[PDB]
Design a protein around this ligand. Structure first.
Ligand SMILES: CC(=O)CC(=O)SCCNC(=O)CCNC(=O)[C@H](O)C(C)(C)COP(=O)(O)OP(=O)(O)OC[C@H]1O[C@@H](n2cnc3c(N)ncnc32)[C@H](O)[C@@H]1OP(=O)(O)O
Ligand SMILES: CC(=O)CC(=O)SCCNC(=O)CCNC(=O)[C@H](O)C(C)(C)COP(=O)(O)OP(=O)(O)OC[C@H]1O[C@@H](n2cnc3c(N)ncnc32)[C@H](O)[C@@H]1OP(=O)(O)O
Lengths: 375, 376
């Protein structure tokens, strides 16, 4: 049958910074208090993000020990890699233990692993580090996805669907783990998109167990993965470019990204839902990657969504920031937890079918349809 | 049916450097002539490689323009990335055009794209650049495999098999493209493995079209992908470690790597071929990632292969050097092309089943079983 999500677990770094305090923290730790107008602008940017708090692996102490990370485009990749090459797999293990505990079956039954991040690279990769950390089978089939960015929560679901459905008995562990230290930069008047980026992202990891043919007495389906699309939005290549250089992961973020999503989003919805005979956008539940608050707003406008349709997406953005590839998988967890807490008839807000969107460089949209599980 | 390889295309950069001249070239362009004894030892290593020439996208002019590439651990990542971020996808496009031309069906029918490299990263990635360059469908489903390493020619086949077999009518384009500029380094006494590494690797890209349910009137099966296995070799973690730093892609490569493969290879063969009822190693054809000449020798000795079983593997090592993730895919093309030129009865040297091995960090071994196709 369809690849089905059987367990979800999430984790974050312990250090939390409130968004209402972030501009002061940031201008202080980067020694940039002399840029008063830019501080004022960043205060405005933070207020607009609709983010309440963010967990960050990057500490004040690490920055003090590695100052170069605060000086715009000074060499600092080695310090970044020193954090994220062990950080990323360790955070991913924390989420994966929770998923494995919820699922409840022996870890020995995990046949495939998909490890996804956008922070650092190394050989052996973070996937190897995860198997050693978790004690998974040395013969587990691995899919190491590096430098993946914000649509890749859709990518992992698209990949896991084919692995689970083509391999009888298989059980796939998905881990997305993101640490934003790779793209932290001090303020610079010529790079306002880079400044904006300092308010957007937080750290986190999500882990899922996915398989077809659930043993219903002991496994608990949460959602089935119905179909996956991936497409490049015409004439949006300039929207987002990020290069891995001696100074860290750089940022080129166009201010019209939200409008580029608005122009294309009804066609991605229609392409996913017309095959199912669904044309009423409010008859389905939505999990929308919160690249920024304005992206959510444009999706709600262009799909003509009731005011609460994107609650679960806005809730994740508020409590954690944009978690890059793990973000939409925190939203799947939010949707199913809230549905159970409210006593809905289904895991997808009492509705039968839902649509998940990931948005990343290219511009790429990943559109995944999920079917709820009747409860 | 089984995922089947339907077309193969390769490409290399134009600049070719003979291995018999590499020691002199290397020590000259890295301005290290005063390291006479290291120079002498580099001549011995190059002689041992069993490599005749390599194609390299890295030029002398580029090195003179970016001198920190030749200074051991000076900051040089940005120069490296400025080369490989455009070079990898362009070189992969040249291989892909050839594969698609062999195939002959419309490029609009490619539904999935697997792009794999071990040289540089960028966002949007090399997969996106390739779609633009080739004019694939904007909706092609992509799998961007970065920092993959020498076992990843087995990886791409493992992944394409599941995508082709689970998606009716799908046709997967696989591209592996490697440019070794990301790991070039000047000589240094305290890093002899990094010196050995300047002699092993060459540049190249391979592209394959894979699909299940071949339309036989117009598509030509080459090999079917029977089974795939990936497994970490016990206690070999420190054998290979490569870090991407301000100075480029570093190297830690242990001298006993060939024996670590030898200790474990018979087991890899047995797990793949026992379920097929096969026990005679000389009854199958073999495609062995030539991580170095000593790896081939150990695999040959430990499996007791006859004298020419590894010919095709030794042949691409000789003509191209170790091409990292694309290396085994050039070997697959060498096997089927040599088999048809000699009039063998099958595309796998006249034999029915074959085993492909990739070896990379972890240590990881990827083992893929291929079934050959009858010629005539
Ligand atoms: C790693 C990945 O794979 C790739 C990723 O980076 S994808 C990142 C995707 N997310 C974003 O692109 C979308 C962010 N956009 C938004 O959500 C909103 O624009 C926002 C929360 C950033 C601001 O909210 P808003 O309603 O647009 O406010 P608005 O007043 O217009 O703008 C905030 C301030 O930032 C500016 N700003 C916003 N986006 C900008 C950009 N990309 N570059 C330059 N400055 C920009 C405005 O110009 C404005 O400044 P002033 O107060 O100095 O006049
Ligand atoms: C990118 C990735 O994904 C990861 C990769 O890099 S995987 C790379 C895998 N490839 C290999 O490990 C190479 C395997 N080794 C080889 O095939 C052979 O050792 C070789 C062709 C390099 C030399 O052949 P050989 O028969 O072993 O010759 P041998 O005389 O013992 O050795 C060559 C010289 O290099 C030295 N050498 C070989 N490997 C060494 C290493 N890893 N570290 C240090 N020095 C080494 C020897 O000590 C010897 O030197 P002297 O003449 O100064 O005494």
């Amino acid at each position: 049958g369809l690849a089905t999500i059987l367990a979800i677990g999430t984790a974050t770094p312990p250090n939390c910074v409130a968004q209402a305090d972030y501009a002061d923290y940031y201008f202080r730790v980067t020694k940039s208090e002399h840029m008063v107008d830019l501080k004022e602008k960043f205060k405005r940017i933070c207020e607009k993000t609709a983010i309440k708090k963010r967990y960050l692996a990057l500490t004040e102490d690490y920055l003090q020990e590695n100052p170069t990370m605060c000086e715009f485009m000074a060499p600092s990749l080695n310090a970044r890699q020193d954090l994220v090459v062990t950080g990323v797999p360790m955070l991913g293990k924390e989420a994966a233990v929770k998923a494995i505990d919820e699922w409840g079956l022996p870890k020995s039954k995990i046949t495939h692993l998909i490890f996804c991040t956008t922070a650092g690279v190394d050989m052996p990769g973070a996937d190897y580090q995860l198997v050693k950390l978790l004690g998974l089978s040395p013969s587990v089939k691995r899919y190491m996805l590096y430098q993946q960015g914000c649509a890749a929560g859709g990518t992992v679901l698209r990949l896991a669907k084919d692995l689970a459905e083509n391999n009888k008995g298989s059980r796939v562990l998905i881990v997305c783990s993101e640490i934003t230290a790779i793209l932290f930069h001090g303020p610079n008047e010529n790079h306002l998109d880079s400044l904006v980026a300092q308010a957007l992202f937080g750290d986190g990891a999500a882990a899922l167990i996915v398989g077809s043919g659930p043993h219903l007495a002991v496994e608990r389906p949460i959602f089935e993965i119905v179909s996956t699309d991936q497409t490049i939005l015409p004439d949006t290549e300039k929207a987002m470019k990020l290069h891995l250089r001696e100074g860290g992961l750089t940022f080129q973020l166009h201010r019209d990204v939200p409008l580029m999503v608005a122009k294309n989003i009804e066609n991605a919805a229609e392409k996913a839902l017309s095959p199912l005979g669904i044309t009423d956008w409010n008859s389905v539940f939505w999990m929308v990657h919160p690249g920024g608050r304005a992206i959510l707003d444009q999706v709600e406008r262009k799909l003509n969504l009731k005011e609460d349709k994107l609650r679960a997406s806005r809730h994740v953005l508020s409590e954690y920031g944009n978690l890059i590839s793990a973000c939409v998988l925190f939203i799947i967890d939010e949707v199913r937890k809230r549905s159970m807490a409210e006593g809905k008839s289904t895991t997808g807000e009492g509705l039968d079918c839902g649509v998940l969107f990931g948005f990343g460089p290219g511009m790429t949209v990943e559109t995944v349809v999920l079917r709820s599980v009747r409860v």
